[PDB]
Amino acid sequence: KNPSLRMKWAMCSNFPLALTKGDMANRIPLEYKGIQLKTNAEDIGTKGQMCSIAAVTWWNTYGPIGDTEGFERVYESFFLRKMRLDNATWGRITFGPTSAEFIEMLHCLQGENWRQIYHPGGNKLTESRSQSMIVACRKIIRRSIVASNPLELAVEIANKTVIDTEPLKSCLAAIDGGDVACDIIRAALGLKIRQRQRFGRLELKRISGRGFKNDEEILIGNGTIQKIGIWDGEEEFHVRCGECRGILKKSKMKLEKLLINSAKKEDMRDLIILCMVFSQDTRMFQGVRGEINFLNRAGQLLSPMYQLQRYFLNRSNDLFDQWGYEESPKASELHGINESMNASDYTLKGVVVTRNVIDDFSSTETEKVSITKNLSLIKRTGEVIMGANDVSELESQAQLMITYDTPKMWEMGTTKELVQNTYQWVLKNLVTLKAQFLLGKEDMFQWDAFEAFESIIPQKMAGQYSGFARAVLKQMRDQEVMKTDQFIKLLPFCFSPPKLRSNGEPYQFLKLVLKGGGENFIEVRKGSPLFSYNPQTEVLTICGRMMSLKGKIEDEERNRSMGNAVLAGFLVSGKYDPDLGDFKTIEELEKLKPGEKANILLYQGKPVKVVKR
Amino acid sequence: MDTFITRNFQTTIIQKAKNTMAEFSEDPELQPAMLFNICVHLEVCYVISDMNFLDEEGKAYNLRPQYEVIEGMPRTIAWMVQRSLAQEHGIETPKYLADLFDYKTKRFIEVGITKGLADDYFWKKKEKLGNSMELMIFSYNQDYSLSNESSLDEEGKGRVLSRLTELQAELSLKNLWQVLIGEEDVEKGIDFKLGQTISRLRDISVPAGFSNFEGMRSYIDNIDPKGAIERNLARMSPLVSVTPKKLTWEDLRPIGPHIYNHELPEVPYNAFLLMSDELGLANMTEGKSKKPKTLAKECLEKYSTLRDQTDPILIMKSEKANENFLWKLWRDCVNTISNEEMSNELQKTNYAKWATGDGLTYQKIMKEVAIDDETMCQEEPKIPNKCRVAAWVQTEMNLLSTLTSKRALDLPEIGPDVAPVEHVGSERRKYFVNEINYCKASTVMMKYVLFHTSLLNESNASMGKYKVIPITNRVVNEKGESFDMLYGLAVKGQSHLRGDTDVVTVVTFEFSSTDPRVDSGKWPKYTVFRIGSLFVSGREKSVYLYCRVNGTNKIQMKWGMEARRCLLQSMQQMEAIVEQESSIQGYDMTKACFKGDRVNSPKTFSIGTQEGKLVKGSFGKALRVIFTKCLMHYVFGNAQLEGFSAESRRLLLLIQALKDRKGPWVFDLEGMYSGIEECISNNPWVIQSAYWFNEWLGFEKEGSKV
Amino acid sequence: NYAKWATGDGLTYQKIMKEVAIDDETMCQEE
Amino acid sequence: MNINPYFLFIDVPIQAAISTTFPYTGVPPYSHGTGTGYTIDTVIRTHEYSNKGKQYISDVTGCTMVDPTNGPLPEDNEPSAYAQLDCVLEALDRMDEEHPGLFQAASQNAMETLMVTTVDKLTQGRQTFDWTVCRNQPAATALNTTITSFRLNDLNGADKGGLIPFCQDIIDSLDRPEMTFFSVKNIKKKLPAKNRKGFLIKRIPMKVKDKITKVEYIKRALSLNTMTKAIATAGIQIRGFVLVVENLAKNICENLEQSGLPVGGNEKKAKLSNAVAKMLSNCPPGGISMTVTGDNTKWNECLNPRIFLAMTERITRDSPIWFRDFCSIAPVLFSNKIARLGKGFMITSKTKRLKAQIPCPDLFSIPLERYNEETRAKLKKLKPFFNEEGTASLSPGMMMGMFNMLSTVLGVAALGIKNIGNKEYLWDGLQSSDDFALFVNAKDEETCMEGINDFYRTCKLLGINMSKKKSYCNETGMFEFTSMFYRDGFVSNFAMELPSFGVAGVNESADMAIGMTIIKNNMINNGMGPATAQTAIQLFIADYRYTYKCHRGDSKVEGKRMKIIKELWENTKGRDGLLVADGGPNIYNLRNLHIPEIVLKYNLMDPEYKGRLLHPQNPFVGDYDAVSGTHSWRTK
Amino acid sequence: KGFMITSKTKRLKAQIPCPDLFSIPLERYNEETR
Ligand SMILES: [Mg+2]
Ligand SMILES: [Mg+2]
Ligand SMILES: [Mg+2]
């Protein structure tokens, strides 16, 4: 009645697995490197041969390579599930108060107190160019937003980004499609874009009227005073959202007319809600009975209009409830839609669907806008047309490999790709890095690669790690000859300002841990699953991706002991003297008086002795 | 199967058949033959009803048809239509759900699809139903059986027979004629009879006032009970009432006041292992996993003075304990661990039999002898003692919630985050482990889990001898160093049985630096020797050995091993707090709660009192307190603690209603208090929880007035 | 089995090793 | 500073602060209410709440029977079993009025499911009493033993496959003058010992043809044994009929908006929210809506099988007589039930250091002065209902959860009255068998309390006993239902069965799928959060790697299989495609808990590794979704 | 042979040999033996 304990005991046995009979079953060696894989026992009557789990491992490592054609055909449902998951788009997760393709993700979509927006995908491949361009532009915008002077970072990252093989600038100049982020990047690079007013996903083109925004203090449903710029005067715009279009006539805090056509239900709802929020209707302002404190990924506070937009996009019912209703006329072309976007004469107050086709306003209008520091696009007249706030928050995986050749985007790695890039960059610039290091100059620590590296160092220990690395490097440079492998290993950590203890000395460490631990650590004196080196073969294995080190290494940095650059302020002396005591912990090394000796164990079989200076 | 069903039947028929079959079968897709039968039956029913029409007076041509289709619709509405027709037309309602209703003769119609032949299925349907409803039987092969002459004519018969023929041919030529199932097999079983014994048992299972079951059946089937409830409520005694009372703050009194009685003993420590007084002997390693015996051997080699102490300096003795037995058991355990053999078997098994008290077990005798023996009586139950609050529980809570220099948690990795919910969970986990990694409670929990794992592992074939199970752990400090910690040694007894509940004796000898005489009332269950002295950072600390003879079983071993779920419990509690915070807003509040955003300041909690003044702390301190509370709830768990935690919830919810100004009412407040207080006898956690609840209730009362 | 307890043959003290007897302070000679 | 955990309530709502107070939902290892004492206590309590009713002697088994139904109305607030048949019938009639065709639809659906059910279905339950051996055995074993012993008695209904013929044989075996069966005995047989005597006494489970009389068989069929690993188990003679009765009750329950037992997961919160919103919307303008979080005292001990027989009779009123007779059997058999009292007690001599277990048949064979006080009083009260075979008669009451659906139907029928005397209040609620939430809308709190009092009295009339010591009331918007706290939309859980530790124990290929599915279902149904689910994934991966010795290939762990895992790590280029059982990295997260890991890693697998792993001729292969491979091996 | 010591509550008995006559405290003997 204890399957877990029984299985644990069985796996500790010798030959617990039943093995069939045949040529393939006879291809397993009797024993591999001293490990008994299959029992050489002939059962009396059952004739049942046994094998160890090591036999399964041996088969997977060295067994015959059987044909693997048509495997995806047999398990087609599982591969379809994987494809649906991979091609899907993720929206936003909202807290507080169905197709079979959605029930699959029910665990990741619906919680007791939270809900995740999920758009399933699958075989949407044709327009991979534009999809990848949009994804790249959105990622660039997100990265540049959180940085001071977003425009400079965005322009310097967009120039170093390639979709498949074509530079992102070429994709932007050629495809001409995209979204708000694509337009922002296009204007950032100096290209031309179609001119349309943006409010979230709502594209507006004025066709009649005038407005003069005035600062006012408005009251909202939840009972708070907000400073809003309200628009006065009768204005008319052609509005669009995804696959839906319409005409909006509005006035001061009032929506007069809202004609629209039939389109996707979700697109209809988004267009209609955004039209209400743009109309600045007081009837809309009164529907706010929650808390509007929504922020952006930069951590700043959204402006009131976008606050209301986000609130009502999340909570649409709070508006359709406090929007009233009316009866649409029985004209054939004219219609009405209820809160669920159905065919019902009991329609929303001032909203009406129509049969006649509204000509799309997207006439070729390639112009040259001016982009501000904060990714705000402004006409020659001086009126903001779009900004970072209107960029969609949807996230998806690009259909074509995009690569950003710049350290600023290395943060989008897995903390192992980031380390890989950092150390490959260190190796490539090893000669110049060492030449600059051997000059008494420390600007090298400020390079953008180390910026990216610091994003995976625990903020709590980053200063101590940096102090330790800098002290070790200074010891390896000034008071003693350098070791190339240790210099490479400890150079990235030197960025953060030193956080030396009150004694003035650095913090001694045995390992340096990074984000997502377990195997993401750098051993200060021994090989690690993330950084290993062969002192003789001159091979630097970073994450198992061995790279050579010929030439860059030196003749004199081979006879030197590794124990000269393992603890700051300590220098090897004597040998493994077994009189001082056992291998001291770092705590006693830190507490040791200057001029004292100590014993260390570099690794399994390499004791050494050191002395404080 | 699905392909042929889709091709040969229109969508409406298929969906109607699926809906009809889903009502009584919970695995509709696992049996498509029933789907075939139902869709064919519905198609036939439509053929009979769709084309035949009628008119107002008698014209069998307006829009009135002469057939009403009761099939293919939900049974709830089908039964309404059937009963309505039967009542309106003055006819009896069949006990079965008919398929059609004929308006020319006003009769319910049952239609069947016979694979074999009609006039045989017809008589089976007659036996099942009888004279309740007319029958229309049509067979795959051309044949029919109708119970009326004015019923379906030849024109409908041709269409139905052709419809059957096409399906028959397709099944014949598509190898699916083997899947077909006749309707008879769905009607299997209507001849259920009651014997002579079951009928008589039924006759004597009727309520008072009935002679036999037939009278009860007729009474239920014929009597209108309207007005009975009010009739019985009018004549019910007024003393039967809820007696509601509007709860106030003055109605909430301290629970279990006897805990403040100083004439009672203070609760003694009774956990399996030392939690905050534990002392582990540390030996640096390279992280390589070692056998428990080898780990203990090396740890004892590093401390030879403690290992080689062969004389007992007795500091404290339990009332019924034998210090000689315990010291000899400890020496046997040490010698066994230090020997070069690979077995943890104790050398002196005969002595260990009596040193552990295993030899003092009563002797089972024949029930006859005991029956004649007038001196054999049932023992009185052991009433738990009534104890008062002990300061050591507060000290344990204070110490276990602090941060140490060692962490025992090293969890594996998971896939990268791609969804926003995954990022939310990852951030929450990051904060949780940052606040909990170096908590003392984490190491204590890991020690408990490892000890119980080792105890259970040694129950495969070693339940008949005496073993020594080291109490060990593996920890890592902020510098990356790895230490093996030996907290003591336990000798595991032996149960001749293997019943998963038989008690096995475990004698635990745990290192400590705590003088037992500083808090005498905490250690009446332990006999303590001073085994030596230790140097840690230039300070000499005395090292005592706490020895105690406890017991357990495989069930308790598994429970202690499962004690690691306190981590998940604390994670879920933190997630609930953060989700409550973010429900007020529309976005996740993890960073706002923990670090604090530009709009939201870092959330602070009330963590305790300092000289009667509330003290605030961060969310990390609150998390450590939550984890320690969960760990102590698990460690001290028993029937009393389970009852106290299940019962005080109602009082807590009443207090929440009072705070929210929801105007709570109660029906028996003293009953609630008695139910809560019956569990406060000797559990240290329950008594401390009562003390803490009284203090917090006083604070809530004082805050209610402001 | 019944005769064993009826005659009192089952109510006989069981011998133990002298080591535990020496260690046990409650084992005393009978007056 | 002295840390007070309760101070967390000063800053957090108590609903969120007491989330998952218990990390388990099963019975703890210490709160075991099992034994002869507990069974006797249950019998005494059950007969105490019905001792003012009729008392007679069964003419079939000869036991003493107590009938509380249609008895005198209670005069105090103690638990009452004196349900009135007329009140129950009126409640059910109003329930039928509110839901036209529901009783008939449920009856027809249950009847058809019965006509389609097969005898093999009586194997999916838990331990069941076996009369042939008079012991608790797994459902399949008991079913097979009963079928064989029936074949011995010329009762061949199980061979036909249908459940109705098997039940017909079950009820016809009650008429056999005597029943022969196969009993398993540990026969102390002869063996040539090595000793001088040469007689090594030893046992073996031999099957023998035993015979019992009609009355003994009837008592065995009506018997329910005490559990050790619900404190009672019923035999195979009752499961066949309880199945159909519970199916009918579930058919009724799933169509009632007040029923909330079938619901589980995110639709339970939806049910709570919908009930709260519906009650708030219907409150009179300027009125008050209150919610009572209720508990029922002695729910099982005060519900009578006679009332359930009346319920089944009323529900199946328009059904064919054969189905009505089939449905009446289960309550009929439970109204004549016999309780087996367990192993017995233990009496010891401290001076002689002796102990002996007195079995149940011999409880009264020694003077009651040799039992402790509580057991002596228990036996004094039990004597009238004690049969001289170690069993007691329990005619009134429902033992434990056996008719949960029907009890929920009765509770919802109580909630459907909605009013008494045309007073100025209206009540609704949610029922989950013995747990309930009541909502009362009125003009002021005084009329709300009047409505709550009326509901309490109506429940007393129906045999339901609300707990005054555990139920309470507060303004609507905050309450608890089936351990789920609701407050202003926010929802929490008091207890959650967090994942156990270990592996399923099938094989390394299926264990990963089983664990991932367990986590997925926990975060779907049990309300597990993202961080908790990810931590559960981490803990399961740790347990998996510990059990199957399949740590990462870049780790430093010694072992027979780890030695080859390291070589596989060195040889492989696409190490991200290796399975966890092959030392590869773990790539499971919340989004991909429903995809097999082989399918997940296929596009990253090396050609040679994927060929060897997915070798159709591999010698190892010879719910959850898994892909067959070298890791889908078997253990003897 | 030695002396026989006994425990009545535990119903145990043992034979302390002649060499170990003084191994136990003399208070555990009877007056005459002591
Ligand atoms: Mg029909
Ligand atoms: Mg319940
Ligand atoms: Mg409840």
Numbering used by the authors:
A (entry chain C): 43 to 139, 226 to 741
B (entry chain A): 1 to 61, 72 to 716
C (entry chain D): 360 to 390
D (entry chain B): 1 to 229, 240 to 632, 655 to 668
E (entry chain E): 353 to 386
What does the paper say about this structure?
In the nucleus of the infected cell, influenza polymerase (FluPol) uses the viral genomic RNA (vRNA) as template to perform synthesis of either capped and polyadenylated viral mRNA (transcription), or unmodified anti-genomic copies (complementary or cRNA), which then serve as the template for vRNA synthesis (replication). ANP32 is required for both vRNA to cRNA and cRNA to vRNA replication. ANP32 comprises a folded, N-terminal leucine-rich repeat (LRR) domain followed by a Glu-, Asp-rich intrinsically disordered region known as the low complexity acidic region (LCAR). First, it stabilises the formation of the replication complex, an asymmetric FluPol dimer comprising a replicase, which is part of a parental RNP and synthesises the genome copy and an encapsidase, a newly synthesised apo-FluPol, which binds the 5’ end of the nascent RNA replicate to nucleate formation of a progeny RNP.
Cryo-EM grids made after mixing apo-FluPolB and hANP32A show a majority of dimers with a 2-fold symmetric interface, which are quite distinct from those of FluPolA. Several different pseudo-symmetric dimer structures were determined at 2.8 to 3.1 Å overall resolution, almost invariably comprising an encapsidase paired with a variable partner. In the apo-FluPolB encapsidase, the PB2 lid domain is disordered (as in FluPolA(E)), but interestingly, is observed in its normal position in the 5’ cRNA hook bound form of the encapsidase, due to subtle displacements of domains. Given that this encapsidase-containing dimer requires the hANP32A LCAR for stabilisation, we suggest that the LCAR in fact stabilises the encapsidase conformation. Biochemically and biophysically, this is found to be the case, since FluPolB bound to the vRNA 5’ hook is soluble and monomeric at 150 mM NaCl and, furthermore, does not bind hANP32A. This highlights the fact that hANP32A is mainly required to chaperone apo-FluPol, even though we see no density corresponding to it in the apo-FluPolB symmetrical dimer structures.
